Amino acid sequence: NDHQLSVAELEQKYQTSATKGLSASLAAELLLRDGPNALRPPRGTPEYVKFARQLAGGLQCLMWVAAAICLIAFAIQASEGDLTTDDNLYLALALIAVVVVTGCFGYYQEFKSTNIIASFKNLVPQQATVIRDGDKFQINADQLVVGDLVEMKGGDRVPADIRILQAQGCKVDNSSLTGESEPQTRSPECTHESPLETRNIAFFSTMCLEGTAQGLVVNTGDRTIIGRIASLASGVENEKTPIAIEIEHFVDIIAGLAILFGATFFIVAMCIGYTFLRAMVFFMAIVVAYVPEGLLATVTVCLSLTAKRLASKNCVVKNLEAVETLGSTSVICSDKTGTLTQNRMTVSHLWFDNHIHSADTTEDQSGQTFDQSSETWRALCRVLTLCNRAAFKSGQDAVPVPKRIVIGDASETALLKFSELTLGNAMGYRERFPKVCEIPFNSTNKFQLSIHTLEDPRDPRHVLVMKGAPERVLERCSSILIKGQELPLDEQWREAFQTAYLSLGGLGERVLGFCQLYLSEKDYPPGYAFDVEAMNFPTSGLCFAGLVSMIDPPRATVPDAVLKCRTAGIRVIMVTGDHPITAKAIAASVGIISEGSETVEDIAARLRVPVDQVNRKDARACVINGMQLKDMDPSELVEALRTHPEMVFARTSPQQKLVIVESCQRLGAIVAVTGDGVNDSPALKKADIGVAMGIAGSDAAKNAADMILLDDNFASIVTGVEQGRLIFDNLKKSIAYTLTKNIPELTPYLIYITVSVPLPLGCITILFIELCTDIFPSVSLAYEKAESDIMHLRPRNPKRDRLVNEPLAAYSYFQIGAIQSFAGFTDYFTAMAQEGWFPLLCVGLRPQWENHHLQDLQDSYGQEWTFGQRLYQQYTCYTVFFISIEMCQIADVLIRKTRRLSAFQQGFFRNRILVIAIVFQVCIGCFLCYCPGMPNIFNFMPIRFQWWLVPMPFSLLIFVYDEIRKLGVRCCPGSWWDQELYY
Amino acid sequence: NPDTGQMLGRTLSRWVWISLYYVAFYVVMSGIFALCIYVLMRTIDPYTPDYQDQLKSPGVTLRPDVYGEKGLDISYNVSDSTTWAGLAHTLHRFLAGYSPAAQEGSINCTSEKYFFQESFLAPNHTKFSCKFTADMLQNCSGRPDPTFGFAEGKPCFIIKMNRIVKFLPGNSTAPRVDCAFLDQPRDGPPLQVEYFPANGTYSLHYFPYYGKKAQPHYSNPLVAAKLLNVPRNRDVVIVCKILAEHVSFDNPHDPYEGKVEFKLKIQK
Ligand SMILES: CCCCCCCC/C=C\CCCCCCCC(=O)OC[C@H](COP(=O)(O)OCC[N+](C)(C)C)OC(=O)CCCCCCC/C=C/CCCCCCCC
Ligand SMILES: CCCCCCCC/C=C\CCCCCCCC(=O)OC[C@H](COP(=O)(O)OCC[N+](C)(C)C)OC(=O)CCCCCCC/C=C\CCCCCCCC
Ligand SMILES: CCCCCCCC/C=C\CCCCCCCC(=O)O[C@H](COC(=O)CCCCCCC/C=C/CCCCCCCC)COP(=O)(O)OCC[N+](C)(C)C
Ligand SMILES: CC(C)CCC[C@@H](C)[C@H]1CC[C@H]2[C@@H]3CC=C4C[C@@H](O)CC[C@]4(C)[C@H]3CC[C@]12C
Ligand SMILES: CC(C)CCC[C@@H](C)[C@H]1CC[C@H]2[C@@H]3CC=C4C[C@@H](O)CC[C@]4(C)[C@H]3CC[C@]12C
Ligand SMILES: CNCC#CCOCc1cc(Cl)ccc1-c1ccc(Cl)cc1
Ligand SMILES: *[C@@H]1O[C@H](CO)[C@@H](O)[C@H](O)[C@H]1NC(C)=O
Ligand SMILES: *[C@@H]1O[C@H](CO)[C@@H](O)[C@H](O)[C@H]1NC(C)=O
Ligand SMILES: [Mg+2]
């Protein structure tokens, strides 16, 4: 492009001049041809479309269909002499109301999370310096046009994509756009083929760190690198979450069961003499009966509780479905710069006393320190403290040293912070050692020199301190300091120094050499005229103190978080735009590459053989750079991924990060992406869950992510994994509990239709069971603890381990639900018999029972009943069936606490929320039964105490049966019993 | 998912085992339910119900009972015999059960007092029940008027009280029927009724009812209310109340408790 294209061939495409620039009229006309030099906002999403999205969903659509079927049944029963059809309207209204209120709750959660995330979003107006027709005036950044002449200096933001023509010590921060952690030199010459790698292109969103530069605008607005990344992210489609897929599968199961049951009883109704309309109404009644109305509310509440628990650890989800994804995640593709690391140059290693030392690089200084008791260390510390010009901003006592703001470049800032952490009061020490001469850093000599005088009044010498490149320093420095000595260079120190230099270089660290010399008081008396131009002072024959190396180090919690993730069976891949050596060093530091793992290059270097003669299967680790990835087809990428468990992708473009995520997803994995910069936003959008750093994160990354770590704490990923697995298990338990009670609510209606007994259970009491009495106990199961070491399990197989499966459905519906139905019918017949209606007389009684024209119908004792008296007896039947269901649901919630462990092992009362929910359920039941006016308001009756006791043996049977079943599973791990009776 | 080897994710042998397990489960549950019902029915008393929570006050029914939109509605034409032929036939069918041949299993009672029986002295371990014949309704018995006064515009309505085991209406005086206009028309006098038996009483010796097993031949005593001054070609509402110490007729949710109300129109 323009970078491999000289200023002669430039100025013709852009009709500009390197010296003058653009004419005012030409600039104003280009500003009309193209738009302003600005990025388009992410446009759309009106406030009601989000609510419509909340109203949509799998369970929501099932409920919408159920309500529509209710309406159709009401219409059909109004088109004939059925009537008495307020039940359909009540149920349709309940379904719609539950859907609407749950949608309101979800919308409120997303709105609150959006406000929380935007609370940490700022805004600033951007200006630029431009030279048009010879006048160097200031201008707004978006006024710029392609071909404009632009001037930038240290501390300014680059105003557009610019091809550098002049540069004097210019460095830029590309860590957000690229993965490069170290400041990058900008020079007016082509250094690489790609525009992302050359030194003569400066990019729109980046910050100039130091120096000055001049260049020509080559791209503007949405056509810049960041604009093209934003365009790429806009084209990435967000997929369904795993929990949404599981809910859809469960809805399919419910629909299939409803269809089968309804068709069977449609045929039965045909065969026992019903009309076509009657049988169709029965079929639609059964189909609607199989839809659980309160389950959507239960699921929403459980997800919200998990979200609140995560937010207690500063982990904020943008939607409720995201609280589960980390539990199912099997691959984490992590960004390096700013995500795994602090994105801050800090002192990591030192070389003095013929030893390589390690410093504490953690931002909270929780690590280990090196040996600070030696004359060599004292000399090295004095040299690195004195040969420094950086300074802390005034008034920074509260903020810790690694977070303090410093006026200086990255290397000097790191040296100043290291001085503050080791010696303390670096600036005070500096002013206690006054300076009398100084040669700043420049490229002719590639070092920096300064002269000071001693603190003590009894020492007249002047101390020379020099800092610079290790080889430039070693060309000087005839001597070396080793344990209170000044040993001359015996070429053994030279070879040792070279070995240390390449060792620290291979660790991917920038290395600097430090040295000192003590000037004589005779040759250099006090008040000596040190002349920078005369070069009188000795710049040779120095004494070498030591080497100091720097790296952008990992965040403190990152290595342990990575280890825990890999213990949980999750594969961790590093995907960075940074350089391969630094990427490999950091991957080894954080645990992505394990100790002893080797690449093919490492194996070849060890075995003294060319790499092409090294077996790939012996290399556990692999480092692939972007140029190799470009040539690779998807088959080769898949082969490499399956061949090498410990994978690092370095110098990776945003598109290639997206490609890697897509390849991992095609292999069948649920993929999480952690990132902070703009270069991560497309991969974040493509990920099943995207996690962005709250503080380090760019706006594009935070907008693309589903989860935000507000405190930049990487261990929140581990917390999310544990909570996702826990919520998966507890949702399983809660769904089983909710589904169990649908069978005892349906079977009385089937018996009513086929045997024609008086109605045992009403629509209103069913609504009360579904929406009032059972929701709190169902929600209380979200507080159950894990039944095993959940963090040592492997990630679930998405295609095999479903949230709701056949064993769960079969057990809940047709064993526990069947027992509850039997309990309810026992209570129903007891209440009828003790009030005068024997069971055989109840069979076939429904027409006479419901006949408004029979006011003296005889019971088993010959007593004559009015219609109103029979209706009150029917309400008593409603109430006893309701109480039977409630009593059995107490045992159901108790047995639902565990799937494998005994209730005695897990603890009956450890879940105080569950205990409170049981007490609350019983209290509401008593209130409904015994509040005055209930018989005529909700048709509950003040039932006799023995109706309470009749279902209790059935509840005990439920508990004992489940306990025996789970003891069979524990004692016989992989028997037929475990295969069929475990869920 | 259907296949040859594994049908719906199960081999044919596995289907057999899981199906047999479910069959055993449901057999055990059905046996438990049957045992519960058997125990209940063995605890049930064959003569007296355990509770009468819904039977605090007896219902009241009327014959002939023709229902309209909301409740009893009787309308006919004195000129056209076809209009009241069905009503007369209904009354005849009802009194077939009070014919003297139908009353063979009962005895003559004259005590005019509660007929308390603590032993089963009647045939086949049974308690005695008192006789009620149609002739005790006299003019409204179907003889000598087979139209029950409908032809002459003075129809007979038979009021019957629902029977409750061991219920006692009150023994200071016999329970009595009282029929009146619900809203007395301002164009005429109040309702004039002649009752059969005289004063419209149910004799106390018809109480208490001991149930169907103890008294298989029990017959509810009847009262006939012959309306004498119903205006012609007008819609009137008539309520017949039971006046007894233990019979209440103030239930907003049961309009048949202790009383019966019907619409009547007699056209000419
Ligand atoms: C997929 C498999 C489903 C299986 C469903 C259950 C199947 C079994 C259900 C019914 C079969 C009979 C069960 C009852 C057995 C009764 C035991 C017994 O020996 O009792 C005797 C009584 C008669 O005694 P009595 O009155 O003459 O005594 C009077 C006493 N004195 C004279 C002193 C007053 O005989 C009776 O009552 C018989 C009454 C039986 C009919 C009741 C109405 C049927 C309703 C059934 C609904 C059940 C639903 C279950 C939930 C399904 C969940 C999926
Ligand atoms: C879990 C705890 C929740 C607590 C919620 C707050 C507390 C509210 C509860 C009660 C406060 C009011 C209490 C009632 C007034 C004082 C008592 C009274 O003055 O009694 C007079 C009568 C008694 O009637 P009775 O015994 O003859 O019954 C009929 C029996 N039969 C079958 C035999 C013919 O009352 C009548 O006549 C009918 C008069 C109207 C009905 C009573 C008024 C209150 C009832 C419903 C209001 C809304 C409650 C539902 C809220 C949503 C669902 C939870
Ligand atoms: C878990 C913590 C629980 C803490 C306590 C819960 C709240 C209790 C508060 C109030 C309930 C008692 C006061 C109202 C009832 C008397 C009103 C009345 O008058 O009832 C009358 C008779 O009463 C009784 O036979 C007894 C009443 C109480 C029965 C049991 C109460 C529920 C107890 C449950 C404990 C279960 C524990 C085990 C399971 C849970 C384990 C954690 C009913 O009238 P009737 O049928 O003669 O009317 C006939 C005329 N008709 C129908 C037309 C109106
Ligand atoms: C007649 C009624 C009570 C049912 C038949 C008897 C029941 C209780 C017994 C008798 C034979 C038993 C089966 C014998 C063989 C197997 C194979 C085993 O791998 C699973 C259990 C299973 C399937 C048993 C289930 C329970 C069983 C069916
Ligand atoms: C109890 C009555 C309705 C049984 C009538 C016969 C038919 C419908 C029964 C007999 C055996 C039964 C099966 C036994 C075991 C299983 C395996 C379970 O994973 C899914 C359902 C399933 C549970 C049942 C489906 C229904 C079934 C085929
Ligand atoms: C969990 N299952 C509960 C149930 C059930 C069985 O029929 C539903 C039902 C029961 C009763 Cl009492 C009254 C009306 C209905 C009903 C009828 C028609 C429709 Cl379109 C929807 C509902
Ligand atoms: C009842 O019958 C008697 C004689 O059978 C008669 O005198 C009397 O008038 C009748 N009463 C009515 C209202 O018809
Ligand atoms: C029925 O009664 C009406 C009075 O509204 C009368 O006009 C008519 O003639 C009567 N029917 C016959 C068949 O006379
Ligand atoms: Mg980054």
Author numbering:
A (entry chain A): 51 to 1033
B (entry chain B): 23 to 290
Please give sentences taken from the publication describing this entry.
The molecular targets of acid suppressants, H+,K+-ATPase, is a gastric proton pump that mediates H+ export in exchange for luminal K+ across the parietal cell membrane accompanied by ATP hydrolysis. The catalytic α-subunit (100 kDa) comprises 10 transmembrane (TM) helices in which the cation and inhibitor binding sites are located and three cytoplasmic domains (the nucleotide-binding (N), phosphorylation (P), and actuator (A) domains) executing ATP hydrolysis and autophosphorylation. An accessory β-subunit (35 kDa) has a single TM helix with a short N-terminal tail and an ectodomain with six N-linked glycosylation sites, and is required for the folding of the complex and membrane trafficking.
Although the two crystal structures used as templates are almost identical (RMSD for Cα atoms = 0.755 Å), at least same conformation, to our surprise, generated candidate compounds from each template structures are distinct. Others showed lower apparent affinity than DQ-02 (IC50s for DQ-09: >2000 μM, DQ-14: >120 μM, DQ-15: 49.5 ± 4.9 μM, DQ-16: 89.4 ± 13.5 μM), and some compounds gave scattered values due to low water solubility. We therefore modeled two possible conformations of DQ-02 in the binding cavity. Two benzene rings are likely bound to the Tyr799 and Ala123 similar to SCH28080 and related P-CABs.
